[PDB]
Design a protein around this ligand. Structure first.
Ligand SMILES: *[C@@H]1O[C@H](CO)[C@@H](O)[C@H](O)[C@H]1NC(C)=O
Ligand SMILES: *[C@@H]1O[C@H](CO)[C@@H](O)[C@H](O)[C@H]1NC(C)=O
Ligand SMILES: *[C@@H]1O[C@H](CO)[C@@H](O)[C@H](O)[C@H]1NC(C)=O
Ligand SMILES: N[C@@H](CCC(=O)O)C(=O)O
Ligand SMILES: N[C@@H](CCC(=O)O)C(=O)O
Ligand SMILES: N[C@@H](CCC(=O)O)C(=O)O
Lengths: 214, 108, 141
């Protein structure tokens, strides 16, 4: 459904788009060698009678002892680990994207624990696209699993945001060809030429360039 | 004013009881099941060895989840020696998977 | 201590036992789901088969009101019970969005005349009117 469904139906001979390397995406279309790297990570917000009074100060001590304990017991999110062990934040990803495809068909312990949280909450924590992903972070308590090049662009724009955690995985952005074309290898030699002349990383600071916040 | 000092020590005691509690729940990485859950402290074996082959061909749910972490992080966690295994533990957070005897060469 | 809020909070503990109407749409859904939270919930009800799958929604009310038991109703019949009886509450949210439907046999000729008879019935505003004639169970907060 979406890109690849049109590619195997031989509609749109080129696809050029954020199509990413996923093993299930390679089986039905041989899409081309990528032009730019990729890694999924989290986009959580950057934050913002002497005995009678003796019982009272011991009552306020233990209640302030417990309140500061559980608060300190609560971990600030700096990984996918503590993000998985905390059901207060209602994290999710793009529905029917390569992100949720990765968390579904992976068998590693912590990311399967993340998929157990999202499959119970398929109606709520899943979004339509990255714009629905950005807004649910900025308004409500949420931590969004967008891919790499959308992370640095929005953190340069919205200084309310930050990148939490390193690269969960490693991928790239490919170009969709229908089932595997001979025209695919013409593109592969072309992208090697276009990155050699530097115009790949010259259009880089042309279009991301969001000026940041130190 | 002595009652004001009586409150500021209570918040200091409550701050001290909060910090002394959370560091006494903390258990370090003792066992493999204590090591199977966390993905910060990374794993590793000798590439193409008997230990790498065992985790690939085991059906134990504790050890199969450990293989999925090393297969995903393939080019960085499977060093190729026992010597580079010593270097990567001595540097950043890394739990290398030796055989039992070559432990006692290194841990002495 | 957090009480049993969600299904994933309820999927781990084996003390507070589970249950559905035997041979219902809820029992069938947990048997034929691939979600790892819901597949582990089915293994508890399949193992405890003769004691957790009661056969009514009425015996489901009796077993929650007695010992520790979390019965798995549909979403609407919650609000009949959680307004007639203020000892019971809806913990969690919607597990899976379903829909009640008038069941006709396979390839029935009456199916296309019930569907138009329903789409007229809510535009006249009586599926909402017949709704608040039976769900007003005394309004118990
Ligand atoms: C600042 O903190 C408040 C609560 O203390 C929170 O509601 C708000 O979202 C925070 N600001 C930002 C920009 O997240
Ligand atoms: C982002 O931060 C600016 C100030 O830095 C603030 O005015 C704005 O409301 C924030 N947007 C949010 C929290 O969505
Ligand atoms: C159940 O609810 C009724 C109505 O509020 C109340 O009187 C009763 O004490 C509750 N508990 C039991 C065990 O019946
Ligand atoms: N690159 C993703 C979309 C963006 C995302 O899900 O983070 C895809 O091909 O589905
Ligand atoms: N003794 C092991 C190598 C060391 C290890 O993998 O721990 C072997 O024969 O492969
Ligand atoms: N409405 C359900 C019965 C009630 C339930 O299982 O929660 C059905 O059609 O089977």
């Amino acid at each position: 459904n979406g890109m690849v469904r049109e590619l195997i139906d031989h509609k749109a001979d080129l696809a050029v788009a954020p199509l990413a390397i996923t093993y299930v995406r390679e089986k039905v279309i041989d899409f081309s060698k990528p032009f730019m790297t990729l890694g999924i990570s989290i986009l959580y917000r950057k934050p913002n009678w002497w005995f009678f009074t003796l019982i009272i100060i011991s009552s306020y001590t233990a209640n302030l002892a417990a309140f500061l304990t559980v608060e300190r017991m609560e971990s600030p999110i700096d990984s996918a680990d503590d993000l998985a062990k905390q059901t207060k934040i209602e994290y999710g990803a793009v529905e029917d994207g390569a992100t949720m495809t990765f968390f579904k068909k992976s068998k590693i312990s912590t990311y399967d624990k993340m998929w157990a949280f999202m499959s119970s909450r398929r109606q709520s924590v899943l979004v339509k696209s990255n714009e629905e992903g950005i807004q649910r972070v900025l308004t409500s308590d949420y931590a969004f699993l967008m891919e790499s090049t959308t992370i640095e662009f929005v953190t340069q724009r919205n200084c309310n945001l930050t990148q939490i955690g390193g690269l969960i995985d490693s991928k790239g952005y490919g170009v969709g060809t229908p089932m595997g074309s001979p025209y695919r290898d013409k593109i592969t030699i072309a992208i090697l030429q276009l990155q050699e002349e530097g115009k790949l990383h010259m259009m880089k600071e042309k279009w991301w360039r969001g000026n940041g916040c130190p």
